[PDB]
Amino acid sequence: PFSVKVGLAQVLRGGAIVEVSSVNQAKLAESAGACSVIVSDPVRSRGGVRRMPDPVLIKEVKRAVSVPVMARARVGHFVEAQILESLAVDYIDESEIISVADDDHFINKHNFRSPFICGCRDTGEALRRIREGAAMIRIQGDLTATGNIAETVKNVRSLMGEVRVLNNMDDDEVFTFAKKISAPYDLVAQTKQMGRVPVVQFASGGITTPADAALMMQLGCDGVFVGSEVFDGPDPFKKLRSIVQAVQHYNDPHVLAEMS
Amino acid sequence: PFSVKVGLAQVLRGGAIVEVSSVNQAKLAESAGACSVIVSDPVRSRGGVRRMPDPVLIKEVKRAVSVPVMARARVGHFVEAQILESLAVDYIDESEIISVADDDHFINKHNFRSPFICGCRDTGEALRRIREGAAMIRIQGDLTATGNIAETVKNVRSLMGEVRVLNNMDDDEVFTFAKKISAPYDLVAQTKQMGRVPVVQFASGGITTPADAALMMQLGCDGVFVGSEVFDGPDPFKKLRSIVQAVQHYNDPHVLAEMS
Amino acid sequence: PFSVKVGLAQVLRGGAIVEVSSVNQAKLAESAGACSVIVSDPVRSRGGVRRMPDPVLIKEVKRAVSVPVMARARVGHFVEAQILESLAVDYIDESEIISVADDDHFINKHNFRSPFICGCRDTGEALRRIREGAAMIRIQGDLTATGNIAETVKNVRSLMGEVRVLNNMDDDEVFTFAKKISAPYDLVAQTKQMGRVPVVQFASGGITTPADAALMMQLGCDGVFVGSEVFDGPDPFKKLRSIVQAVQHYNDPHVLAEMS
Amino acid sequence: PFSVKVGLAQVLRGGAIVEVSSVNQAKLAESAGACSVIVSDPVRSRGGVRRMPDPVLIKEVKRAVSVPVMARARVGHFVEAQILESLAVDYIDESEIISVADDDHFINKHNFRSPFICGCRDTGEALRRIREGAAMIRIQGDLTATGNIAETVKNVRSLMGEVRVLNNMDDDEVFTFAKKISAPYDLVAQTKQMGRVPVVQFASGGITTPADAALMMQLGCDGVFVGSEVFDGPDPFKKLRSIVQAVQHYNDPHVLAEMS
Amino acid sequence: PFSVKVGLAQVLRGGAIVEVSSVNQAKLAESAGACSVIVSDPVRSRGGVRRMPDPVLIKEVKRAVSVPVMARARVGHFVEAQILESLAVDYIDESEIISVADDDHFINKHNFRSPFICGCRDTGEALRRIREGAAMIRIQGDLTATGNIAETVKNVRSLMGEVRVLNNMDDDEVFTFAKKISAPYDLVAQTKQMGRVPVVQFASGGITTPADAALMMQLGCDGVFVGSEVFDGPDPFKKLRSIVQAVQHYNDPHVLAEMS
């Protein structure tokens, strides 16, 4: 059922999901206070094609840390999702930062038992992914390009603005709106009656400093995706702890200035 | 409820809906054997703007004939639909051959008690109209242009072909298909599980001879819309009776040759 | 079967098929010596939409003359073809000079018992029509435009040239050729092994004088389609007799000069 | 005859065809459990023009392993196909990843005694190759470019979708469909009556991990083409065994997770 | 006279013309069994402008080998042709792989006593060169670019196809055909009455393996031009002998497999 999957997915509200690559980085992200760790197999990506992490690394990370352990599957690759569901991962991320498997179609996420996290860039994609069965949505910026926050905040603002426009729209115009954004009408009506999309919204792309995570959490999101670019700094633990405390206390400026 | 409206609408299956313009033409179309008469107020349209017929003409036609009496409302004009529903017309036709009131939006046909007939040109428009609340769909060709049947048969073939493609599509591709035709996914799944759209399909545009009505009924439609271009011939009663008998016996070529 | 239909169709070889419009014109074209008479219902076409002739006119013409009586059906309109087959017409002409019913698809001429005549403009269309089931092919020029012979002779030359190229082509290139002209490969191989398309080829469009019919019969065709533009001259019988004698004696220049 | 060639070709159903380059790699691919080994002569391709492998290498590979030994011939180069048929190779691959010999035409595969494997990218090319005489078809993605699976799964989805559309199409539209995809009509009707193309379908291009082979076998294919990019890894035998076991057990997720 | 020049030129039928660059390579190509050796002066071309070989090298090669010794002259450079005719070379090659002297005009090959070999890319160029006086024609592919055979086989197929089309064309269309290919009409009529162009046709460009030479000789050519890219391999004598035996036995697949 979709209700129980949303219930399992909404325990990550108000936390930071850290991208780890080994048992040591997983233990570090757990000790920092991350809500979950998403696994990437390589230490470095030498400009090649990326794919689902190797299963023994996922088993090691899952045995080491006690926080939920996500995993990445190429978009449209349902066999990788089946393999991940067999490994009993807590959440499966139908990720588009990894090389795309199927450009046209996506994974029919209703056949699986594990909750899914899908990326979006506007309300149309978010509602389409929720219709396909995604139990959690992440607003995506720009990965593999830089550490800038422009595209992420732009997409978050776009999504929140479209949802606020929907929440006050006339009932006669909801159909034309759903046609304009190419979204299923039932989910559009649910977003109109609820005020938010009926899933958990995280942010991704460019979040490096505590200020960026606090900004993402002040725009209305529920959490941040902290990539692996933090573990190559001078002290990864301090950065991770500061980001986590920023997500937890996004309203207090003194705590933010202390973590920064 | 939508179920009872579809039930009231599906009594027109296997009949011809004749466009009448007066009490005499209404009585003629009733004596010919039409399943219903759709009302157009003027005797002639002098290149002006057309709109909903005048209520006393609808009352006269409804008092004269005992067959269902439809009425036309400009697309997007919900006040004309309210006025028609107040007159207790059996069916309301959200017609696009009459001048368009609202180009962007349509009528929220869920607020009304009378069944609605909406025009379409492909499966996307048909499913959108069924989602808005249309209890009956007519595949439209080209009105106010000529008496040709090309556009009507083209649209009927397109709709039936899209429905046949849906009926056999892979379950993973139904989402991308619904996005491609911009239709609500629940109605797309209903059309896939049912084999036809879950309403009554009529044809319109260019049906003049019995051969055209039999062709429209052999492509899979459920009835024809016979315009007012039949009453300006030498003998309208013979043409109407031949069209009705053609719709009733679309499979027998001898009856068709006798009516022609 | 297709063999018996080709057998019934190939009795028109070396004759002129005259377009008649009434019992008197049919008797005139029979007394002139036409091999068959193709029926057109109106005396004049007032710039409207044309369609299959009215059945009582076909019955009258068929009762009057003893030569084969053709009939015209709109391309893609199979119900008109069913009605014509019910009237026991000798040949059915899936004509494109009459307004087109179905622009995309044609008639599945395998379901009918009467031989079909289909129009073409190159070898690709000819082979496609023979594959659909056309028992006779007419190379078409330009109707409803003028009385010029340019397009007709151009199309006849194109078809005969493509067939002559096929007859000598290398066996390895026949597949690429069939792909280039978009024709079924079995019919392409049959045309290569036979030297002509495996049907009877007539010409149509602009044939007015005996010289034009003799030219069409000297390019390799098997007959001509003489339209109704001959009956509006000063003496239709003399023109028809001259055209028939020209088709019969296309090789003798003295007979041609006498008929002209 | 084509029937016996399809019979000899359909013994490869449910297996992986490994691209080997020497006697040692051939023995390795045989010990892994490959259904057949396709031969490529060089150890490396230094950005030059590739062609049919040198005959003594084919003789050595054929003497070493007992599994079927394929061979590659440039598309349009029938003399290389004659040389390969003289060497008594089990299957000849009219390959397009090797430099093209004849851009316009292909090999007339009816003159040869050995079964042929032809590449395709849609149903039109597949049916054209089956008409030319190809006893086996491989859906091709992108070679010599990367190790991505996007183009391969896109082409497989396109072909299976076109075949599913054909299987349910109206009988009157099959002719226009065959014209649209430019395929011989007899093979189109055979695909419509059979539900699949009347040959064995393999996949090629980018298959590296067991998940990719299981995905290709879950989309409806009958086998995979595992290129030579597996023998340059740390342990080629483990990768080959995992791919073979994935093709054999494409439905079991636990076996897939164990092989991965 | 042109007849005696064609007679002297047609002794090369069924042989390979090898491009040599020194006395040793000339002796090697003679011992391999080449029908003639075409002389190129340099050991390497360092991206400069090439021209007629130096006369003492031609004299040395002509004194060493007993097979005919060709020579290259820039297209449009008649003084180089005069110098070559003075050296009593057996054949003069008006070559376009060497830098072009005159882009617009060619050599008036009627003023010379030695037979000429001219390059072509279609039947128009072939007939124009035969009209200018070329006693032998070579169908050219792509030199100085790669070792691919695509352009050569494309041009050979184009020329043979145009000649086969001519051989069966209607007599009234030969004039328009000659205008379309811009060829002298007398030579077009000679090609129509003869079935081939009235000269000896060789192939050039990309012929490296015995399979390529056998393919060129199976398409209808009379010989191959084996460039100097064979003498920079590990064993030039084996390659040359295999190419010669392939040209001699282009119909036997066992001999071809033995030479390959």
| 3-state per-residue secondary structure call for D153-215 | HHHHHHHHHHHHHHHHCCHHHHHHHHHHHCCCHHHHHHHHHHCCCCCEEEEECCCCCHHHHHH
Is there a contact between B122 and B158 (Cβ–Cβ < 8 Å)?
yes
Residue B53 gets which letter from DSSP? P
Mutation for testing the D interface, residue in A45, A57, A72, A83 having most D CBs under 10 Å = A83
In Å, how far are A235, C185, D75, E20 from A29, measured between CA atoms?
A: 12, 66, 55, 72
Q: For chain A, say whether B186 makes contact (Cβ under 8 Å).
A: yes
Angle in degrees, 0-180, between the axes of helices A185-194 and A174-181, rounded to the nearest 10: 120
Which of A78, A179, A184 comes nearest B185 by C-beta?
A184
Residues 6+ apart with CB under 8 A from D44: none
What is the distance between the alpha carbons of residues C217 and C139, in angstroms, rounded to a whole number? Answer: 12
Q: For chain D, say whether E35 makes contact (Cβ under 8 Å).
A: no
> What would you report as the CA-atom Rg of chain E, rounded to the nearest whole angstrom?
18
In 3D space, the residue among E104, E126, E122, E140 whose CA is nearest the CA of residue E200 turns out to be E126
In Å, how far are A238, B102, B158 from B124, measured between CA atoms?
A: 54, 19, 11
Distance (Å) from the C-alpha of residue D123 to the closest C-alpha of chain B? 16
Q: Looking up tokens 């394929």, which residue turns up?
A: D70
Helix (H, G, I), strand (E, B) or coil at D92: strand
In 3D space, the residue among C140, C95, C94 whose CA is nearest the CA of residue C115 turns out to be C94
Helix (H, G, I), strand (E, B) or coil at E124: helix
Residues 6+ apart with CB under 8 A from C198: C6, C130, C187, C190, C191
Q: What is the resolution of this structure in A?
A: 3.2
Buried b or exposed e, range A68-81, using 16+ CB within 10 angstroms: bbbbbbbbbbbbbb
HEC readout, C204-240: ECCCCCHHHHHHHHHCCCCEEEECHHHCCCCCHHHHH
Helix (H, G, I), strand (E, B) or coil at B242: helix
Which of A78, A105, A184 comes nearest B176 by C-beta?
A105
What is the distance between the alpha carbons of residues B212 and C101, in angstroms, rounded to a whole number? Answer: 9
- Chain E residue numbers with beta carbons less than 8 Å from the beta carbon of C169 are 161, 164
Ramachandran region, residue C181 (left: φ > 0; alpha: ψ -120 to 50; beta: rest):
alpha
What is the distance between the alpha carbons of residues E61 and C230, in angstroms, rounded to a whole number? Answer: 80
What is the distance between the alpha carbons of residues D75 and D125, in angstroms, rounded to a whole number? Answer: 13
Cβ distance C85 to B253 less than 8 Å, yes or no, reads yes
Is there a contact between B187 and B131 (Cβ–Cβ < 8 Å)?
yes
Structure tokens given for B113: 């008690």
- Residues 152-181 on B with a CB inside 8 Å of D are 157, 160-161, 164-165, 167-170, 173
Amino acid at A167: N
Helix (H, G, I), strand (E, B) or coil at E10: coil
Q: Looking up tokens 């063999």, which residue turns up?
A: C3
Cβ distance C103 to B150 less than 8 Å, yes or no, reads yes
Distance (Å) from the C-alpha of residue C223 to the closest C-alpha of chain B? 31
Buried b or exposed e, range D81-98, using 16+ CB within 10 angstroms: bbbbbbbebbbbbbbbbb
Is there a contact between A16 and A224 (Cβ–Cβ < 8 Å)?
yes
Ramachandran region, residue E239 (left: φ > 0; alpha: ψ -120 to 50; beta: rest):
alpha
Is there a contact between E126 and E178 (Cβ–Cβ < 8 Å)?
no
Neighbours of B194 (CB within 10 A): 12
> C-alpha C84: how far from its chain's center?
17
Structure tokens given for E55: 């006369």
Give the chain B residue whose CA is nearest to the CA of D171: B161
Residues 6+ apart with CB under 8 A from E109: E81, E94, E116, E118, E132, E133, E134, E135
Buried b or exposed e, range A219-251, using 16+ CB within 10 angstroms: bbbbbbbbbbebbeeeebeebbbbbbbbbbbbe
Amino acid at D214: A
> What would you report as the CA-atom Rg of chain C, rounded to the nearest whole angstrom?
18
What is the distance between the alpha carbons of residues B13 and B11, in angstroms, rounded to a whole number? Answer: 6
Residue C71 forms beta bridges with which residues?
A: C92
Amino acid at D241: R
In 3D space, the residue among A50, A52, A21, A49 whose CA is nearest the CA of residue A37 turns out to be A21
Phi, psi of D202 (to 5 degrees): -110, 170
Mutation for testing the A interface, residue in D151, D153, D249 having most A CBs under 10 Å = D153
Helix (H, G, I), strand (E, B) or coil at C50: coil
Is there a contact between E256 and D83 (Cβ–Cβ < 8 Å)?
yes
In 3D space, the residue among C247, C242, C245, C244 whose CA is nearest the CA of residue C215 turns out to be C247
Cβ distance A104 to D154 less than 8 Å, yes or no, reads yes
Cβ distance D49 to E153 less than 8 Å, yes or no, reads no
Neighbours of A144 (CB within 10 A): 11
Is there a contact between D38 and D26 (Cβ–Cβ < 8 Å)?
no
Distance (Å) from the C-alpha of residue B141 to the closest C-alpha of chain D? 20
What is the distance between the alpha carbons of residues E19 and E9, in angstroms, rounded to a whole number? Answer: 17
Helix (H, G, I), strand (E, B) or coil at E27: helix
- Chain D residue numbers with beta carbons less than 8 Å from the beta carbon of B173 are 157, 161
Residue E231 gets which letter from DSSP? T
In 3D space, the residue among E6, E32, E4, E5 whose CA is nearest the CA of residue E17 turns out to be E32
Is there a contact between B163 and B126 (Cβ–Cβ < 8 Å)?
no
What is the distance between the alpha carbons of residues D39 and B52, in angstroms, rounded to a whole number? Answer: 76
In Å, how far are D246, E122, E146 from D225, measured between CA atoms?
A: 13, 40, 29
What is the distance between the alpha carbons of residues E227 and E209, in angstroms, rounded to a whole number? Answer: 12
Give the chain D residue whose CA is nearest to the CA of B220: D170
Phi, psi of D80 (to 5 degrees): -65, -35
Structure tokens given for E135: 């006693």
Size of interface D-E (CB pairs under 8 A): 54
Residue B34 gets which letter from DSSP? -
Phi, psi of E192 (to 5 degrees): -70, -40
Is there a contact between A196 and A166 (Cβ–Cβ < 8 Å)?
no
Decide: E and C in contact? Rule: 3+ Cβ pairs under 8 Å. Answer: yes
What is the distance between the alpha carbons of residues C65 and C49, in angstroms, rounded to a whole number? Answer: 28
Is there a contact between D53 and D20 (Cβ–Cβ < 8 Å)?
no
- For β-strands C116-120 and B91-95, DSSP reports them as unpaired
Alpha helices in chain C (DSSP H): 2-9, 23-32, 55-64, 78-86, 123-132, 150-168, 174-181, 185-194, 210-218, 236-248, 253-259
Q: Looking up tokens 């025009």, which residue turns up?
A: B119
Size of interface A-D (CB pairs under 8 A): 55
Mutation for testing the B interface, residue in A77, A130, A131 having most B CBs under 10 Å = A131
Phi, psi of C56 (to 5 degrees): -70, -30
Mutation for testing the D interface, residue in C109, C120, C172, C177 having most D CBs under 10 Å = C172
Cβ distance B132 to A104 less than 8 Å, yes or no, reads no
Structure tokens given for D219: 């989309």
> C-alpha C127: how far from its chain's center?
15
Ramachandran region, residue B138 (left: φ > 0; alpha: ψ -120 to 50; beta: rest):
beta
Distance (Å) from the C-alpha of residue C190 to the closest C-alpha of chain E? 18
Distance (Å) from the C-alpha of residue E255 to the closest C-alpha of chain C? 24
Q: For chain E, say whether D80 makes contact (Cβ under 8 Å).
A: yes
Using CB atoms within 10 A of its CB, is residue C167 exposed (0-12), middle (13-18) or buried (19+)?
Answer: middle
Structure tokens given for D254: 């636990």
Is there a contact between B173 and B181 (Cβ–Cβ < 8 Å)?
no
Return the H-helix or E-strand segment holding B164: helix B150-168
Structure tokens given for A81: 């999702």
Q: For chain B, say whether C59 makes contact (Cβ under 8 Å).
A: no
Experimental technique, in short, is cryo-EM
Mutation for testing the D interface, residue in B154, B158, B165 having most D CBs under 10 Å = B165
Q: For chain B, say whether A128 makes contact (Cβ under 8 Å).
A: yes
Q: For chain C, say whether B218 makes contact (Cβ under 8 Å).
A: yes
Return the H-helix or E-strand segment holding A239: helix A236-248
Which of B157, B161, B169 comes nearest D164 by C-beta?
B169
Sign for the pseudo-dihedral over CA of D75, D78, D80, D86: positive
Decide: E and B in contact? Rule: 3+ Cβ pairs under 8 Å. Answer: no
In Å, how far are C160, E119, E189, E198 from E178, measured between CA atoms?
A: 19, 19, 9, 16
Mutation for testing the E interface, residue in D39, D83, D108 having most E CBs under 10 Å = D83
Residue C95 gets which letter from DSSP? E
Ramachandran region, residue E88 (left: φ > 0; alpha: ψ -120 to 50; beta: rest):
left
What is the distance between the alpha carbons of residues B102 and B117, in angstroms, rounded to a whole number? Answer: 17
Angle in degrees, 0-180, between the axes of helices A210-218 and A150-168, rounded to the nearest 10: 10
- Chain A residue numbers with beta carbons less than 8 Å from the beta carbon of D146 are 49
Ramachandran region, residue C61 (left: φ > 0; alpha: ψ -120 to 50; beta: rest):
alpha
Decide: B and A in contact? Rule: 3+ Cβ pairs under 8 Å. Answer: yes
Give the chain E residue whose CA is nearest to the CA of D56: E260
Structure tokens given for A185: 């009408």
Amino acid at B235: D
Is there a contact between E19 and E225 (Cβ–Cβ < 8 Å)?
yes
Neighbours of E31 (CB within 10 A): 12
Decide: A and E in contact? Rule: 3+ Cβ pairs under 8 Å. Answer: no
Buried b or exposed e, range B157-186, using 16+ CB within 10 angstroms: bebbbbbbbbebbbebbbbbbbbebbbbbe
Alpha helices in chain D (DSSP H): 2-9, 23-32, 55-64, 78-86, 123-132, 150-168, 174-181, 185-194, 210-218, 236-248, 253-259
What is the distance between the alpha carbons of residues B55 and B87, in angstroms, rounded to a whole number? Answer: 8
How far separated are the first and last CA of chain B, in Å rounded? 42
What is the distance between the alpha carbons of residues B84 and B68, in angstroms, rounded to a whole number? Answer: 14
Is there a contact between A232 and A28 (Cβ–Cβ < 8 Å)?
no
Buried b or exposed e, range D228-244, using 16+ CB within 10 angstroms: bebbeeeebeebbbbbb
Distance (Å) from the C-alpha of residue C180 to the closest C-alpha of chain E? 15
Is there a contact between B41 and B53 (Cβ–Cβ < 8 Å)?
yes
Which of A49, A51, A82 comes nearest D256 by C-beta?
A82
What is the distance between the alpha carbons of residues C6 and E183, in angstroms, rounded to a whole number? Answer: 43
Cβ distance D150 to A82 less than 8 Å, yes or no, reads no
In 3D space, the residue among E83, E134, E71, E66 whose CA is nearest the CA of residue E106 turns out to be E134
Distance (Å) from the C-alpha of residue D82 to the closest C-alpha of chain C? 15
Structure tokens given for A60: 């090691």
| Helix/strand/coil percentages in chain E, nearest 5 | 45, 15, 40
Give the chain D residue whose CA is nearest to the CA of B174: D161
Q: For chain E, say whether C219 makes contact (Cβ under 8 Å).
A: no
In 3D space, the residue among B28, B37, B33 whose CA is nearest the CA of residue B68 turns out to be B37
What is the distance between the alpha carbons of residues C183 and C204, in angstroms, rounded to a whole number? Answer: 22
Q: Looking up tokens 């180009």, which residue turns up?
A: B103
What is the distance between the alpha carbons of residues D228 and D44, in angstroms, rounded to a whole number? Answer: 10
